[PDB]
A paper describes a structure:
Apaf-1 exists in normal cells as an autoinhibited monomer. Upon binding to cytochrome c and dATP, Apaf-1 oligomerizes into a heptameric complex known as the apoptosome, which recruits and activates cell-killing caspases.
In this study, we report the three-dimensional (3D) structure of an intact Apaf-1 apoptosome at a near-atomic resolution of 3.8 Å, determined by single-particle, cryo-EM analysis. Assembly of an intact apoptosome was completed through incubation of the purified Apaf-1 protein with an excess amount of horse CytC and 1 mM dATP. The overall architecture of the Apaf-1 apoptosome is similar to that reported previously, comprising a central hub and seven spokes. The 15 WD40 repeats in each spoke constitute two β propellers named WD1 and WD2, which are connected to the central hub through the HD2 domain. CytC is sandwiched by the front faces of the two β propellers. Specifically, the NBDs and WHDs of one protomer stack closely against the NBD and HD1, respectively, of an adjacent protomer. Compared with that in the autoinhibited Apaf-1, the WD1 propeller in the activated Apaf-1 is rotated by ∼60° toward WD2, which is apparently caused by CytC binding. Compared with the autoinhibited Apaf-1, the WHD–HD2–WD2 rod in the activated Apaf-1 is rotated nearly 180° relative to the NBD–HD1 module.
Numbering used by the authors:
A (entry chain A): 105 to 945
B (entry chain C): 105 to 315
The structure:
């Protein structure tokens, strides 16, 4: 709330009025103001700095905008001077102009000084007597002599880009440093003002462009104004910033530059010619890597004590952010700063990409690399990167191919980064090699499951298992031959082509037994928990750690993603329903209500309604309202503990299952019962004294539309029609027993069912016939589930193993993998192994 | 303990405020001040000198920094002039600038002298009537004609590197000579302020560099 008076003082001062489209930064303004308060008396300078367009001026204008700090503190008026960038002559005029401005009375000589110092005298004297408690604010400022000129011994605060500038000056100096960030909540606030609509009314496109903005309010205002003219071309600029070129965005504005690219160019020029060349080398560095100083030493080839200082000069130029982590320093850039570089240095970059590598060659060889050296991890993680830009494919073969390099990389990096590199790798080299890469990836499929542990089993020995030959196998045989003469007692294997139907991928997330896993709704990533109760979240493709979760109270019981993959509910024995964020990984929602341990958790399939249906051992359902701390509706109904829980495609409905086996299609909208099919459909007239059998449904499978409920229990799958409250389908399972696990597939009407003893058969629903056997999990499976695409499925298991599988492979028959117990009799040169037929004898 | 008033006189004078990271040299400051006290009246020049960077200016600023010697002794304000090194033309401007500084009222002619001596007259007259008990401090100074110019018959103290400089001048002259030494105890005091830690907390390395 501006006082009328405040505006009157401010008008005299001449500070610009804040732009009509602004958004307070309360914390920052408060900090400057409280600090600004600090030099209650006696000279003093305040410096404020940021990379270009960080809200640096507006804050200065805003800080003084308030009555409290200004009025009590500052009986003297406020004077603003726009210094800009100046040659000695230009600077002189500003001084005279400030002279004329300050002396409104004109009592002082009408004649103006021709000498800077004399003007300094007129300022000091005027500040001393004419305006006793005045504060002076400066804009920009690019060189020290300038502040030397203004160094009146009276408080002046300069706001800028370089923080080096106030080094000539004397007296207490404080700096408030404005990082260019902003807030996602705030920018939406800003965007709304720019286009004038309730924030929600804002289009889906809007959220994403702000991510590009990276909080440079200059970009937001720049996009925002740009949109005022053309509300229709909303996506266009989204893809434009996806392009990464800022030449497209331009607006005339109060701000002094057509565009964001425009601002950066102004910063670059100042550096002394010797420094100037160096920055470009700095261009190569990743958008988001804090590189250890050394690598910069290597590229430069200049000694370390020296190298740091030039970088220190940069940090002051606010062109490269500091990182005081321990003795080590990692410097890094804003996404905007990096983008500008490629925009202005792109032709060089391909050329330099080859410069860095040769220098590294003049020092450490990749085999000559060591674990202790600080730089090396950057070298693993990104050296691979530079060679790619280099465009040198033979050199790329000289590095990435090297199996020992893979060994060391998998020693401290893990086996995910290499896979990610390989995908990049494939385009870079040759199609024929691509096969070699295909052979290596195939060699990795066997790596993930047990490779990481510790006893890094002599790969050279475990390698000789691949089929065909390719380039990976060729390497192995020769290595083995080399090993063999010396010793090492390697045993050759002669049956590979006769054995093993290889899975596409295997993951061990936890040393401790897995309890549940779930696909991202997008299908881009998967989360598995375990007995330890830590949950690990990962992106399956490149198969590389994408999330670590510290702990969950009590052993995890199950977990699941939000429909937009923005949340992760976590069920537990403790009863701590910890809904952690899926991105930041920080906790958001949390719930408890169950009398017993939770059986299942799930977010609403509807994008709109936010509910958390939860079964538990107490038999009670708990239909949480995710928007409220307490439950939307407790739902007693099941006569037995809940076996599984899922939201129905109709969010108004809420189906549930339990050991009684009866389906229960609840009416969530009325918070009351609607339908509940009985399940005695598994008719079986045994000599058992019990009457009709008490079916115990487990999985609560859905039709792809979700209009009907597939289920499975005992010896039969069923397809109940809950909307009509009657049975329809009924897919009998293999032989007779009692189902331990089951899983319907909406594609091809498939049914991957683990009956008992990891009997993970691939049946076909409705057609009611098996498609193909699936041998290969140890410990009797613990669980399976299909990809949202349905083209693949995870296979959690008691071993602690998750095997990825293609949909196509399962259907094809593979009468192999001999029976578990056999007797073999050896009569000399050929050995015969006893076998049990896959079907009969 | 600076009086609030002292700062008010000092601001008008224009002496720089002492660097935030400083360490009193009580004996030296005391000597200059007691000596500085000595020319209670009637002209007089004081020379202070040392090899480069001996704390020569800071002492000058520091000596006057105190209330007692300044307030009772010096009803006239203190004026500081930064002479530097000058060709004849350059020197001329400083004089006019001192003219403009001293004559805040402007009662004296707005026109400025084109001749050094005339400026000398404006200084002497201004010192004589406008500021009766004023002390002038100079910074550096590298040649005699310069002090010849400032030789107003009113106390001016010049602080420098050459001690030959005040030979042209007339009237009582005293010199306080600052050897560049400092104290090991003090530098540790200074180093602590520079890095902000209890002196003991300071690393083993620190002791040796001071040597
Ligand atoms: N509430 C707000 N706070 C900060 N900036 C805002 C706000 N609303 C809009 N903006 C945009 C519009 C302005 O062009 C810009 C503010 O300019 P400012 O932060 O003073 O840049 P600057 O003056 O630091 O740049 P330079 O470093 O080139 O001087 O940010
Ligand atoms: N308490 C202190 N006393 C003296 N010098 C200090 C003190 N604290 C820090 N210093 C350092 C910082 C200053 O750069 C320097 C003081 O400068 P000064 O002694 O005036 O040199 P000077 O002006 O005699 O040099 P020149 O002969 O070139 O004019 O000493
Ligand atoms: Mg500005
Ligand atoms: Mg000096």
């Amino acid at each position: 709330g501006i006082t009328s008076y405040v505006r009157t003082v401010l008008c005299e001062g001449g500070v610009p009025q804040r732009p009509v489209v602004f958004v307070t930064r309360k914390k920052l303004v408060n900090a400057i103001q409280q600090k600004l308060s600090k030099l209650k008396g006696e000279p003093g300078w305040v410096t404020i700095h940021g990379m270009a367009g960080c809200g640096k001026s507006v804050l200065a204008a805003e800080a003084v905008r308030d009555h409290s700090l200004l009025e009590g503190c500052f009986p003297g008026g406020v004077h603003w001077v726009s210094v800009g960038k100046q040659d000695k002559s230009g600077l002189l005029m500003k001084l005279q102009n400030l002279c004329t401005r300050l002396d409104q009375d004109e009592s002082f000589s009408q004649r103006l000084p021709l000498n800077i110092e004399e003007a300094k005298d007129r300022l000091r004297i005027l500040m001393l007597r004419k305006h006793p408690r005045s504060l002076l604010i400066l804009d920009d400022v690019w060189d020290s002599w300038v502040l030397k000129a203004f160094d009146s011994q009276c408080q002046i605060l300069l706001t800028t880009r370089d923080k080096s500038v106030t080094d000539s000056v004397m007296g207490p100096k404080y700096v408030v440093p404005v990082e260019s960030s902003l807030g996602k909540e705030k920018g939406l606030e800003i965007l709304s003002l720019f286009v004038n609509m309730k924030k929600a009314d804002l289009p889906e496109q809007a959220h994403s462009i702000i991510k590009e903005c990276k909080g440079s309010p200059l970009v937001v205002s720049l996009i925002g104004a740009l949109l005022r003219d053309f509300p229709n071309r909303w996506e266009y600029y989204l893809k434009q910033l996806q392009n990464k070129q800022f030449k497209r965005i331009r607006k005339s504005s109060s701000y002094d530059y057509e565009a964001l690219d425009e601002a950066m160019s102004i910063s670059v020029e100042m550096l002394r010619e010797d420094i100037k060349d160096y920055y470009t080398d700095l261009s190569i560095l990743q958008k988001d890597v804090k590189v250890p100083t050394k690598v910069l030493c290597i590229l430069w080839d200049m000694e370390t004590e020296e190298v740091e200082d030039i970088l220190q000069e940069f940090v002051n130029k606010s062109l490269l952010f500091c990182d005081r982590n321990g003795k080590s320093f990692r410097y890094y850039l804003h996404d905007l700063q990096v983008d500008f570089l490629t925009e202005k240095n792109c032709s060089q970059l391909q050329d330099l990409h080859k410069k860095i590598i040769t220098q590294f060659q003049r020092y450490h060889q990749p085999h000559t690399l060591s674990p202790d050296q600080e730089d090396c991890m950057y070298w693993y993680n990104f050296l691979a990167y530079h060679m790619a830009s280099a465009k040198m494919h033979k050199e790329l073969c000289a590095l990435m191919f090297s199996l020992d390099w893979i060994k060391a990389k998998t020693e401290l990096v893990g086996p995910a980064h290499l896979i990610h590199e390989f995908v990049e790798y494939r385009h870079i080299l040759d199609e024929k090699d691509c096969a070699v890469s295909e052979n290596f990836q195939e060699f990795l499929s066997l790596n993930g499951h047990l490779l990481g542990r510790q006893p890094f089993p002599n790969i050279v020995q475990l390698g000789l298992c691949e089929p065909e030959t390719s380039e990976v196998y060729q390497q192995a045989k020769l290595q083995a031959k080399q090993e063999v003469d010396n010793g090492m007692l390697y045993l050759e294997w002669i049956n590979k082509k006769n054995i093993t139907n290889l899975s596409r991928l295997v993951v061990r997330p936890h040393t401790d037994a897995v309890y549940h896993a779930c696909f991202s709704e997008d299908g881009q990533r998967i989360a598995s928990c375990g007995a330890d109760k830590t949950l690990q979240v990962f992106k399956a493709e490149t198969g590389e750690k994408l999330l670590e979760i510290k702990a969950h109270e009590d052993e995890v019981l199950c977990c699941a993603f939000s429909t937009d993959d923005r949340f992760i509910a976590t069920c537990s024995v403790d009863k701590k329903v910890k809904i952690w964020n899926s991105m930041t990984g920080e906790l958001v929602h949390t719930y408890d209500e169950h009398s017993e341990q939770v059986n299942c958790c799930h977010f609403t399939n509807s994008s709109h309604h936010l509910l958390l249906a939860t079964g538990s051992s107490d038999c009670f359902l708990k239909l949480w309202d995710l928007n409220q701390k307490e439950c939307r509706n407790t739902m007693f109904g099941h006569t037995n503990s809940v076996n599984h829980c899922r939201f129905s495609p109709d969010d108004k409905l809420l189906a549930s299952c339990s050991a009684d086996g009866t389906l229960k299609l609840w009416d969530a909208t009325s918070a009351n019962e609607r339908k509940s099919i009985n399940v005695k459909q598994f008719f079986l007239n045994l000599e058992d004294p019990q009457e009709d059998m008490e079916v115990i449904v487990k999985c609560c499978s859905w039709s792809a539309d979700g209009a009907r409920i597939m289920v499975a229990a005992k010896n039969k799958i069923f397809l109940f029609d809950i909307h009509t409250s009657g049975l329809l389908g009924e897919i009998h399972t293999g032989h007779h027993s009692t189902i331990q696990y089951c899983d319907f597939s909406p594609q091809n009407h498939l049914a991957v069912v683990a009956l008992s003893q990891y009997c993970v058969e691939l049946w076909n629903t409705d057609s009611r016939s098996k498609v193909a056997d699936c041998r290969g999990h140890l410990s009797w499976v613990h669980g399976v589930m299909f990809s949202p695409d349905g083209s693949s499925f995870l296979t959690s298991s008691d071993d602690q193993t998750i095997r990825l599988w293609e949909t196509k492979k399962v259907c094809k028959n593979s009468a192999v993998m001999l029976k578990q117990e056999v007797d073999v009799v050896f009569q000399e040169n050929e050995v015969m192994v006893l076998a049990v037929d896959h079907i009969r004898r």
